[PDB]
Design a protein around this ligand. Structure first.
Ligand SMILES: OC[C@H]1O[C@H](O[C@H]2[C@H](O)[C@@H](O)[C@H](OCCCC3CCCCC3)O[C@@H]2CO)[C@H](O)[C@@H](O)[C@@H]1O
Ligand SMILES: OC[C@H]1O[C@H](O[C@H]2[C@H](O)[C@@H](O)[C@H](OCCCC3CCCCC3)O[C@@H]2CO)[C@H](O)[C@@H](O)[C@@H]1O
Ligand SMILES: O=S(=O)(O)CCN1CCN(CCS(=O)(=O)O)CC1
Ligand SMILES: O=S(=O)(O)CCN1CCN(CCS(=O)(=O)O)CC1
Ligand SMILES: [Cl-]
Ligand SMILES: [Cl-]
Ligand code: NA
Ligand code: NA
Lengths: 220, 220
């Protein structure tokens, strides 16, 4: 394949005994281990759930450490086209990674949920709607939808979506939540929001709590 | 998959009896049937060879007919990022299409050759070097190598390459041949050229003749 394999991590539900799957998608400069930590507070409430977190296919070239799903031109000093390419390629890799994990867990699409952060959220909102089969749901923390104009045309699947954003975010503007949110609604997605009041570019306890509820319902 | 399946055509060697595979990659505005025509003069000299030609995953939006491997911003009035994305996505689709055809023919990579035209040539020079296993070879007619700077880093496989370009080409400058050619050589590819003297953006008899020789040797 031209496909790139993603290294990853896993918990907590025992290998072979998972009844649902959630995949964490980390942000620019981080790695899977970062978000996979979220498994600690979530697992007791999602007993049958397996949690997986891949590292993005490329090292963060500007950061100097950690990984990126694609470079960020204005921050990275990379070309916008090289960035757009990384994004499309990274989506295919992630698409494949998903199929692989669902196999090893022996689960079907509707038992899978995506939980992203930043750049991870952008990857989730891009890949899921373009998969053949509708997944359980998506939780996107702060939070941007690439190319909202192409959503209606390219949406094969329309899983429920919960957007969670901090109203003091200096990195990704809080206004983006409404942008993503309106476009998902108009494209026919069942769309929910949660506002982390006072919160910047980060995941607050209240946001995490609402995500958990959303996940416990949508998940088997 | 997010993967897109490509409709295609085939000849001439009998289904199940192919000993080698060549895939034609058409240009912006055309379709597979266009280049697949080349099978008529080539088949008698490549008796065991099967010829296949996919249609590019998208309709040519600006043309109005035929297909594109990706839009061409300055000609298409599409964004450069949307174009770069189409390119990376189209490469993954083509990557997959290849694996599929090699299966149905029951052949291995080293028995596959790519023959491109224009945009098709750009797709070939991008995908082949990024496949795990080295193919028989590539013939690229006029002819541009995307992102030559990334070749050395991203070249997993280095099949032989023959570049064929017309020295009167108003569409893709003849200078591009040397650009692609030097970069392939420096990246360690075995690289050949053929100049279609007097020829514009098109495939001349002499170019086709040299391609045939190249193919008869490299192919099983
Ligand atoms: O483990 C350390 C704790 O803090 C992390 O916070 C960091 C997160 O590790 C990082 O990915 C982000 O940094 C963002 C900085 C990168 C920006 C976005 C991309 C462009 C460059 C700026 O900040 C959040 C703030 O909670 C996690 O969100 C939180 O779960 C974790 O428990
Ligand atoms: O079947 C018609 C004959 O002519 C075609 O020629 C056309 C080809 O069908 C087309 O793809 C290209 O047009 C290029 C025009 C498109 C340009 C490049 C992309 C940007 C837009 C301008 O011209 C060549 C000239 O031989 C084929 O090359 C030749 O094999 C075929 O037998
Ligand atoms: O894990 S830690 O808590 O140490 C911080 C995690 N991390 C910090 C650095 N960035 C981007 C750097 S840059 O985009 O500003 O160059 C990725 C996220
Ligand atoms: O098959 S035919 O012999 O009829 C011509 C094949 N064909 C002509 C049109 N172009 C691009 C049109 S545009 O890019 O200039 O809009 C695709 C190639
Ligand atoms: Cl909203
Ligand atoms: Cl040369
Ligand atoms: Na971003
Ligand atoms: Na071109």
């Amino acid at each position: 394949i031209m496909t790139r394999k993603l290294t990853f991590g896993r918990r907590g539900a025992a290998p072979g005994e998972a009844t649902s799957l959630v995949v964490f998608l980390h942000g620019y400069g981080a790695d899977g281990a970062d978000l996979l930590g979220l498994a600690e507070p979530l697992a007791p409430h999602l007993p049958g759930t397996a949690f997986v977190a891949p590292d993005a296919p490329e090292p963060c070239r500007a950061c100097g450490f950690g990984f990126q799903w694609f470079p960020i031109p204005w921050l990275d000093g990379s070309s916008e086209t090289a960035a757009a390419e990384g994004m499309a390629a990274a989506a295919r890799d992630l698409d494949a990674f998903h199929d692989e994990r669902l196999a090893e867990e022996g689960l079907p699409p509707e038992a899978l949920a995506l939980v992203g952060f930043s750049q991870g959220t952008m990857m989730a909102l891009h890949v899921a709607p373009r998969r053949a089969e509708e997944i359980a749901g998506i939780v996107g923390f702060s939070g941007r939808l690439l190319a909202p104009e192409r959503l209606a045309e390219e949406a094969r699947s329309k899983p429920p979506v919960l957007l969670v954003h901090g109203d003091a975010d200096p990195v990704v503007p809080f206004a983006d939540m409404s942008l993503a949110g309106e476009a998902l609604a108009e494209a026919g997605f069942t769309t929910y929001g949660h506002v982390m009041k006072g919160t910047g570019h980060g995941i607050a306890p209240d946001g995490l709590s609402v995500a958990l509820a959303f996940l416990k319902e949508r998940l088997p």
